[PDB]
Amino acid sequence: GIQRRIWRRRTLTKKDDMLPFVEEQVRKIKEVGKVMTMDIERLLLSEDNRFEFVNSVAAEATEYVEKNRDEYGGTKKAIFHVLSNRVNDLGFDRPEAYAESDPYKPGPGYLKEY
Amino acid sequence: GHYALVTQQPLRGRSKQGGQRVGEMEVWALEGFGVAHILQEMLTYKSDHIRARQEVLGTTIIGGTIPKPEDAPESFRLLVRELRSLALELNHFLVSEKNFQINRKEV
Amino acid sequence: IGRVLADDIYIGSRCVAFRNQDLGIGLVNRFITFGTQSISIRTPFTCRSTSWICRLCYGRSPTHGDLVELGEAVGIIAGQSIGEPG
């Protein structure tokens, strides 16, 4: 197979027949937090027992709270941080603790009405 | 808020600012889910664990993690005294899995 | 569907289903399609205990699709499932 270097490129050489208005939908999904539901489902695909998964998540969140008490309880939640870190540990980028706010709030004191 | 004098459980009724009852059918549902720590929350330190009710009030205001009660709620201690009044003694023992020492729980 | 085979299943000299294997609907249809007369499965009646059950004797989870998980309170679910439509 050696010739001078020149070599044969590998190609499909066969036919396989198996080869856009969702902006509001994707944005709403991100706003409500369904990406976290997908992440939770994905994390359990590698867990033999879901009860052990819940226990380990709770223990990690407890460690987070004990180490840095004042960073959690408000816009940052310990369990959300644990879930994001576990998703981030796989190489998939996620916002920290799924913490998001509304950029369209019309100044301080104004509360969004559902 | 206010709890019953004997059972030390939260009062009953909207007018009395009482709490909601978690009946035995609600306990079955939690056992079906396997949520063993939600069940213990509503069995000890949200209902009648006098010592652990006060600490939950303090930890949540400082956000410093709630530990397990590990003691008996006042409803079990109430039952033990009543069984004592029928000349019956009910003791709770813990056997260590390390050195097999029998520990008598205060009840 | 969802039961765990207690014995190997053979078609001629070929093994089409192994012991300790969850029974899918494709396997069941294959058994019906061919001339398979006897199927041996693990049920709650076959477990070596009346105080607990094991994963293989119970079978697949009623809601989670896979095999049932350790620590599941299947007795309370069984009791609730029958009494609910009463």
């Binding site: 009860f51 819940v54 | 056992e31 949520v35 063993a36 720590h37 | -």
Partner: peptide
């Protein structure tokens, strides 16, 4: 459920230089 299965040398000895 979740309750199943119980849930100094080398110091004070550096090179004087």
């Amino acid at each position: 459920g979740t309750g199943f299965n119980k849930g100094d040398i080398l110091f004070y000895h550096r090179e004087f230089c």
